[PDB]
């Protein structure tokens, strides 16, 4: 019944049938993206229409298409041929991951470069790397991947320990042409292995860790209905899954007494980019839009009980499409559980004699994805006290290079001759806000320091100021940790019992934003990443901060073009876009496999409730 239910295998099979019958899914076609469309605004009509958006690639060089289908009715709603030189190429296909290596293996220039290094072509892995937009005019309108080489000494070897530096190749994956092979010189291939399961490297495993048992004797406190609707400790929400964005949260609401109060209409990580800071021509083009170019949802891991998720776990297994329109289940792809979270509130009173302690807990919704060397955990947390938090966990294997004799200002040394270029991992959270409804506004809140003088004779006063953002043109904001800057999303038409507008406060981690020169290609293609906060007016087609087709797109698309409309955002249906990231100077401890590092943000109620919302929590 719920329009927000996960896509079923039957729906995807129906999409396949509708596409094939319409002549849109011949043997030369590949589905590069398929996803359910959210209901339009004001869908108070039970007329449910389940619609799917499809990006269709053509392996013979014909123009790709964007297609919208209605599975409830069984029709193609629209089908548009795409001019990719104008609007961007389609996302990378899983089946193209091997094509770069196979095409280079018969190119005489590539073979000549390997022969000079005495490398057996059968042992050389080539990473399929998105190309970006740079100086090469022949790439405009062609589907290009770039390749960097790594040696595997044997089938189970970690190739990342053996980068082949000084060598890069560009390939046209549709015409099957190697356009350029660039060899800037021979670097020794680092020889130490990085096999973190080899006993010679781990030493004997510890025998000192005793088990920790986490169980729920009476089952979990949350309920799941309709496949993906969660109710937990006054929270209510729907857990969606999209092959591009991954886990998406819908209809986050809090049951306050008898009223179900909305907070967030849709929450997602709508883009993530990994720009590299090594100026070598072998790597200076590297900027991976893991979400927009590769689609993080399609590489979600199956999570193992007791290993990936510990405790009383409820799993969801989302269904996606393969390249031919067949449904594929990601078994155990989403973990959900509740966790104890320490002390919630505590006071021992010297006058009343009352001692009071309550414990906190949080609901966890998580998935893990793998994109080449990177592995990322995406965690959404809901706390008893109304707090909402997102946390990204970055691990995997660092992307490597040679370490140059004489050192580098842009590369860390990890092992003899082995380097790791500096880079960032930058995320964009898209928060379609609905604080007590859709009439919302954003205020910037700064601490205000006051001068000693009249009315402040002892020089102790301090205050704060709030600035309403009224138009999109003034809603591009930067962090200021020194002034304690935060942003409040409030509803000016909904007031608490003190007659103040209800609100939620966004707390950022205030990490550095995009470091690249503002004139660089990546600054233009990832403009969202240059500022910490953007606010737009809601529109159905403004989904991603980088636009719909990120791969090889020249720039400007997305948030800079949206905000040029300069729409009213003062008490309107608005969307907050928060940029946050990790700046990674790799350390020796990151090798040969990296311990998790984290970044995130949180939102806390700010006069949303009439008093603490956790007075009815029992004494444990």
Binding residue ranges for Cu cation: 423, 425, 584
- The size of the chain, in residues, is 620
* Pairwise CA distance, residues 66 & 56, whole Å: 6
Q: Is 107 in the site for Na ion (CB under 5 A)?
A: no
CB of 75 to its own copies, least distance (A): 39
Nearer to its own copies, 30 or 361 (CB): 361
Residues 170-199, one symbol each (x = binds its own copies by CB under 8 A, - = not), give --------------------------xx--
Residues 510-549, one symbol each (x = binds Na ion by CB under 5 A, - = not), give ----------------------------x-----------
Annotated binding site for substrate: 288-299, 371-376
Q: Is 152 in the site for its own copies (CB under 8 A)?
A: yes
* Pairwise CA distance, residues 580 & 602, whole Å: 11
Q: What is the DSSP string of 514-577?
A: --S-TTSHHHHHTGGGGSSEEEEE--TT---TT-S--TT--S-TTHHHHHTT--B-TTB-EEEE
* Pairwise CA distance, residues 32 & 94, whole Å: 9
Applying CB under 8 A, which part among 4-12, 54-62, 454-462, 547-555 lies near its own copies? 454-462
Q: Is 433 in the site for Na ion (CB under 5 A)?
A: yes
* Pairwise CA distance, residues 565 & 587, whole Å: 44
Binding partner of residue 554 among Cu ion, its own copies, Na ion, none, CB under 5 to 8 Å per kind? Na ion
User: Residues in contact with its own copies, total (CB under 8 A)?
Assistant: 150
Binding partner of residue 584 among Na ion, its own copies, Cu ion, none, CB under 5 to 8 Å per kind? Cu ion
Q: Give CA angle at 270 (268, 276), nearest 5°.
A: 130
Nearer to its own copies, 521 or 546 (CB): 521
Nearer to Cu ion, 277 or 333 (CB): 277
* Pairwise CA distance, residues 417 & 414, whole Å: 8
Annotated binding site: 288-299, 371-376, 423, 425, 584
Binding partner of residue 122 among Cu ion, its own copies, Na ion, none, CB under 5 to 8 Å per kind? none
Cα–Cα separations (whole angstroms), residue 280 to 249, 301, 402, 431 = 40, 33, 11, 37
CB of 370 to its own copies, least distance (A): 5
Q: Is 288 in the site for its own copies (CB under 8 A)?
A: no
* Pairwise CA distance, residues 288 & 425, whole Å: 9
CB of 254 to Cu ion, least distance (A): 24
* One residue of 413, 484, 573, 602 binding Na ion per CB under 5 A: 573
Q: Is 609 in the site for its own copies (CB under 8 A)?
A: yes
* Pairwise CA distance, residues 101 & 320, whole Å: 27
Q: Are residues 440 and 424 in contact, defined by beta-carbon separation less than 8 angstroms?
A: no
Residues 406-425, one symbol each (x = binds its own copies by CB under 8 A, - = not), give ---xx--x-xx-----x---
Binding partner of residue 609 among Na ion, its own copies, Cu ion, none, CB under 5 to 8 Å per kind? its own copies
Q: How many other β-carbons are positioned within 10 Å of the β-carbon of residue 170?
A: 22
Beta strands, E only, 233-299: 235-242, 246-256, 259-275, 287-289
Q: Are residues 321 and 243 in contact, defined by beta-carbon separation less than 8 angstroms?
A: yes
Q: Is 41 in the site for its own copies (CB under 8 A)?
A: no
Q: Which residues, 6 or more positions from 9, have their beta carbon under 8 angstroms from its beta carbon?
A: 319, 327, 329
Nearer to its own copies, 3 or 311 (CB): 311
Q: How many other β-carbons are positioned within 10 Å of the β-carbon of residue 121?
A: 14
Nearer to Cu ion, 553 or 584 (CB): 584
* Pairwise CA distance, residues 291 & 248, whole Å: 13
Q: Give CA angle at 180 (519, 30), nearest 5°.
A: 85
Applying CB under 8 A, which part among 67-75, 85-93, 307-315, 426-434 lies near its own copies? 307-315
Q: Is 370 in the site for its own copies (CB under 8 A)?
A: yes
CB of 32 to its own copies, least distance (A): 19
Nearer to its own copies, 79 or 310 (CB): 310
Residues 319-358, one symbol each (x = binds its own copies by CB under 8 A, - = not), give -------------------xxx-xxxxxxxxxxxxx-xx-
Binding partner of residue 96 among Cu ion, Na ion, its own copies, none, CB under 5 to 8 Å per kind? none
* Pairwise CA distance, residues 380 & 366, whole Å: 6
| Contacts to its own copies from residues 470-529, by CB under 8 A | 479, 481-484, 496, 498, 500, 510-512, 515-517, 519-523
Q: How many other β-carbons are positioned within 10 Å of the β-carbon of residue 113?
A: 23
Binding partner of residue 30 among Na ion, Cu ion, its own copies, none, CB under 5 to 8 Å per kind? none
Catalogue the active-site residues: 290, 374
Binding partner of residue 117 among Cu ion, its own copies, Na ion, none, CB under 5 to 8 Å per kind? none
Q: Are residues 241 and 328 in contact, defined by beta-carbon separation less than 8 angstroms?
A: no
Nearer to its own copies, 1 or 619 (CB): 619
Q: Which residues, 6 or more positions from 390, have their beta carbon under 8 angstroms from its beta carbon?
A: 267, 269, 378, 379, 380, 381, 429, 600, 601, 602
* Pairwise CA distance, residues 272 & 579, whole Å: 9
CA-derived radius of gyration, the chain = 26
Nearer to Cu ion, 356 or 585 (CB): 585
- Judge residue 3's burial from the number of C-beta atoms within 10 Å of its C-beta, 0-12 exposed, 13-18 middle, 19 or more buried: middle
CB of 538 to Na ion, least distance (A): 5
CB of 582 to Cu ion, least distance (A): 7
Binding partner of residue 447 among its own copies, Cu ion, Na ion, none, CB under 5 to 8 Å per kind? its own copies
Binding site for Na ion (CB under 5 A): 432-433, 538, 554, 573
């Amino acid at each position: 019944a719920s329009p927000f239910r996960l896509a079923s295998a039957g729906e995807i099979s129906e999409v396949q049938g509708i596409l094939r019958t319409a002549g849109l899914l011949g043997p030369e076609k590949r589905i590069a993206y398929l996803g359910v469309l959210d209901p339009a605004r004001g869908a108070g009509s039970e007329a449910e229409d389940r619609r799917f958006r499809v990006f269709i690639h053509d392996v013979s060089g014909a123009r790709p298409q964007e297609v919208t289908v209605s599975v409830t009715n069984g029709t193609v709603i629209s089908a548009v041929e795409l001019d990719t030189a104008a609007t961007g190429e389609l996302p990378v296909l899983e089946e193209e991951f091997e094509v770069v290596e196979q095409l280079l293996a018969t190119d005489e220039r590539w073979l000549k470069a390997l022969a000079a290094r005495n490398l057996d072509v059968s042992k050389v892995r080539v990473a399929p790397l998105s190309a970006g937009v740079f100086e090469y005019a022949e790439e405009r309108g062609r589907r290009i991947l770039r390749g960097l080489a790594f040696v595997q000494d044997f089938p189970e070897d970690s190739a990342w320990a053996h980068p082949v530096d000084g060598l890069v190749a560009y390939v046209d994956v549709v015409s099957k042409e190697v356009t350029r092979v660039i060899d800037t010189g021979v670097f020794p291939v680092p020889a130490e292995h990085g096999n973190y399961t080899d006993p010679e490297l781990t030493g004997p495993l510890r025998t000192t860790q005793k088990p920790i048992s986490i169980t729920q004797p009476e089952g979990p406190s949350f309920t799941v209905t309709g496949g993906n609707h969660i109710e937990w400790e006054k929270w209510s929400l729907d857990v969606g899954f999209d092959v591009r964005e991954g886990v998406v949260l819908h209809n986050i609401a809090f049951r306050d007494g008898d009223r179900l109060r909305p907070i967030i209409n849709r929450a997602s990580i709508a883009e993530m980019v990994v720009p590299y800071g090594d100026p070598s021509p072998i790597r200076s083009w590297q900027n991976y839009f893991d979400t927009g170019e590769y689609l993080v949802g399609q590489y979600a891991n199956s999570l193992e009980l007791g290993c990936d998720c510990l405790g009383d776990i409820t799993y969801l297994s989302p269904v996606i499409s393969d390249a031919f329109g067949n449904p594929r289940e990601i078994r155990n792809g989403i973990c959900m559980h509740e966790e104890d979270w320490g002390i919630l509130a505590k006071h021992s009173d010297l006058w009343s004699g009352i001692n009071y302690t309550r414990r906190n807990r949080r609901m966890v919704i998580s998935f893990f994805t793998t994109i080449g060397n990177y592995d990322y955990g995406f965690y959404w947390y809901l706390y008893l006290d109304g707090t909402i938090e997102f946390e990204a966990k970055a691990t995997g294997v660092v992307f490597t290079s040679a370490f140059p004799e004489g050192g580098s200002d842009n590369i860390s040394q990890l092992a003899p001759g082995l380097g790791a270029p500096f880079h960032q991992h930058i995320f964009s959270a898209r928060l379609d806000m609905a604080i007590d409804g859709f009439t919302n506004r954003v205020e910037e809140e700064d601490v205000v320091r006051q001068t000693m003088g009249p009315g402040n004779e002892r020089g102790n006063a301090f205050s704060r100021k709030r600035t309403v953002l009224t138009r999109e043109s003034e809603a591009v904001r930067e962090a200021d940790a020194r002034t304690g800057r935060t942003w409040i999303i409030s509803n000016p038409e909904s007031k608490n019992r003190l007659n103040e507008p209800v609100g939620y406060k966004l707390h950022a981690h205030n990490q550095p934003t995009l470091l690249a020169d503002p004139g660089s290609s990546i600054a233009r293609r990832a403009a969202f990443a240059t500022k910490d906060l953007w606010v737009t007016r809601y529109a159905d087609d403004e989904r991603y901060p980088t636009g719909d087709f990120v791969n090889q797109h020249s720039g400007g698309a997305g948030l800079p073009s949206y905000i040029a409309q300069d729409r009213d955002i003062d008490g309107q249906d608005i969307v907050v876009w928060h940029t946050f990231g990790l700046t990674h100077f790799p350390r020796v401890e990151d090798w040969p496999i990296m311990p998790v590092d984290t970044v995130g943000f949180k939102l806390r109620p700010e006069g949303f409730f009439d008093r603490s919302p956790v007075l009815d929590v029992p004494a444990n």
